[model samples]
Target chain A: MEPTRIATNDRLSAAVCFDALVFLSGQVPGQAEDIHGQTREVLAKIDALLAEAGSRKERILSATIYLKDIARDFAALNEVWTQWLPTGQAPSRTTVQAELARPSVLVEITVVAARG
Target chain B: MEPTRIATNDRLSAAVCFDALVFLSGQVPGQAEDIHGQTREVLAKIDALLAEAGSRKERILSATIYLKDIARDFAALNEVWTQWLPTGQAPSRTTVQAELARPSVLVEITVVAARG
Candidate 1:
């Protein structure tokens, strides 16, 4: 269930096993220029991880969004998101502006979905 | 599994993949006002997503909370959450104060959990 890396010093590992589920940490865009582009890259990485877990977007249960600048990029980010969900199969989600690990990375996101 | 929206005219898409699990976009309060009310409303949205994915609070692995004004509403939001989570099965949690979209809205939450 350890899909990715969490800092060595992090008390919480990349993902923690609780009963039957594995909770993961938020991922950032590896390479990108602006918030919008970075958002796509980060999301793509998330998709890959889900596939490895043997699940798909339709199975996602929840998600959290972190933005370096909420006021400036939220609408723009959502514009790309609404169409992304499988019609009405949208998972629960939340977004907030926070100071990310880096400056260029405008957004970082994490998700939870059914596994089995 | 792009379980939500990112933006139509943007570069980043909704959700991403890495080794396993799907990272998804955050959902909003939609119509709620005040941090406490919005926290409950947003959590309800998260619950719906989990249900759609064939999971429950008992299976939730972890969650992150975002607040417009951390100094003010965090405690109230937690008051609503402590009751929402399953008693002993509550997942790991993190809460932070951040800027959210829409001035009236006060809080948002994101979660991650098991798939199989």
Candidate 2:
């Protein structure tokens, strides 16, 4: 079956669901400063988009996290991340330092989750 | 079904296959300096991993590419990428500049593909 694009626009879809999987576009922080606030904002968006796709953070299979400066923000980001994730069900994850599309965008996260 | 991990080691598995989908670890070049050479080397590993997982480049659904220096390598990397991708089955892709795990590593690529 073809993938169903959700919240599509001229650029990209907010999420795409296919074959019991949901792929979310990289989400940037809405309006926050510091890694902690930014991480929380981004994850909140993830929650909303996953809900739209009939999935949830607990069903996430993998996540790719991009930080504008890992050396300075990794620990802070991890703290928020660990708290956000369900206990004993954290998905496979990878994090890296990247220059984001917008300078103000401190963190961008994209995830793959299993749909219920 | 539980995910099948391929080429597992102390650090990470080369690829993980589950439910007709393959998630590849970010692959770096073996021994390449220029962006073209590095891209080719990384994609070669992707080919091998996909094969091991009973998939192929044509089945790739999405790719996340991490470049050390986007201003310099973006165009060159795209040239190689377009050539390597199947003519009419180019996957969704996103590229960003990141400081990789290694200083010499210029490009790292991770992909999601459908298993045939």
Candidate 3:
């Protein structure tokens, strides 16, 4: 079956669903003073998009997070992440430092989740 | 159903499977002279792992690539990537600059594939 695309722009879709998997474009943060705020805001964005795609946070099977400074932000990022995540359902995850699309953005996250 | 994990170690797994989806841990490269060689080596690792997980390169629905220097290596990475990938089967992909687990590694790639 062909993949179903969500929120397509000239560049990319916000999410693409194929064979019961939803693969999302990386979600970046809005202007925030701290990594904690950026991480929280970014995950909030993910919740809405995953909802729109008929998936839930708990259904996420994998997440790749990019922080502007992993050494500085990793623990702070996880604080809110743990609050948002359903206990005992942590997906396979990876977090690494990477340059962002913009300087103001401190966090970016992308995920693959089960659609069913 | 419970998720299936492959190559699980104390920290993480090489790949995890759930609900017909396969999510691979980022695969990094052995020491190589250039981005092209590193990209080739890393894709070969994915090939072996995906084969073990009963998925094919053509079945990959998404690929996330992290390069040490995207501006410098993106083109070189694509050169070898295009050769290894089936011509008509490019997945939804995002490549960005990032620090690797090691200084010597030039490229890291992770993917989600249909498990059929």
Candidate 4:
């Protein structure tokens, strides 16, 4: 079966559904001062996108998070992350520091989840 | 069905197979100096791991690459990446700079592929 793309554009789709999996594009915060606020905003976008793809946060199988400054922001990001994720359904994750596409963005997250 | 994990350890599994999909851990070079050399070694590990999980480079759906220094290593990494991937089967990819687990590692790659 062909993959179904949502929020398509010339460059990328916000989400892609194939087989039983939903893959999301890297999401960034629109505006926030602190790492926690930024993370919360980003995860809110992820939640909406996943819902549109017939998945939910609990279905996430893996996540890759990129931080502008991992040493500075990781702990704050994790505080938001743990609160957002369900208790028993934490996905396998990898976090690293990266120079983001935009100077204002501090966090970028991408995920793979099972469509339910 | 339950996910099948390959090369399991205390920290992570080298590969996880579930629902016709395969997810691999971020692979690092065992030993290498230059960016191209390290990329080759890391991709070799990915190839071996993907094969073990009933997948292949051609089946890769997405890849996330972490470079130790994007300015210094991006081009060299791309050269090796293009050579390793099949001509018509490039996956959706994102690359960024990150401080790796080990100081000597110049490249780390993680991928999701369809299991054939």
Best by TM-score: 4
Of models 2 and 4, which has the larger DockQ? 4
Residue B4 accuracy (lDDT) in model 2? 63
Interface RMSD of 4: 4.3
Q: Which regions of candidate 2 fall more than 4 Å away from where they truly are?
A: A1-19, A30-32, A78-102, B1-18, B29-41, B44-48, B56-62, B70-103
Tens digit of per-residue lDDT, candidate 3, span B61-103: 9898988888999999989998999988899999887876556
Candidate 1 residue lDDT tens string, B1-116: 23332231232333333233433345457676666677778878777666655556777777777777888887898898998888878888888777877777777676665543
RMSD of each: 6.9, 4.9, 4.9, 4.7
How would the candidate models be sorted by DockQ, starting from the highest? 1, 3, 4, 2
Tens-digit lDDT string for candidate 2 (A1-116): 99999999999999999988899999999889778999999999999999999898767767788888877887788788888876655665567787789998889998888887
Model 4 ranges off by over 4 Å = A8-12, B1-16, B28-64, B70-97, B101-105, B114-116
Please state the error at residue B105 of candidate 1 in Å: 2.0
Candidate 3 regions with alpha-carbon error over 4 angstroms: A1-25, A30-32, A48-53, A70-88, A92-98, B1-13, B18-20, B30-41, B57-64, B70-96, B101-103
lDDT values, one for every candidate: 0.65, 0.85, 0.82, 0.84
| Per-residue lDDT of candidate 3, residues A27-80 (tens digit) | 987667788888888998899889988888767778888888766777788788
Query: What DockQ, between 0 and 1, does each candidate earn?
Result: 0.24, 0.16, 0.22, 0.17
- Please give, for residues A6-74, the per-residue lDDT of candidate 1 as tens digits: 233445554433433445568788778876678778777777766665566666656667788888999
- On the 0 to 100 scale, the lDDT of residue B13 in model 2 is 59
| Per-model TM against the reference | 0.59, 0.64, 0.64, 0.66
Give the higher-TM-score candidate: 1 or 3.
Answer: 3
TM-score of 1: 0.59
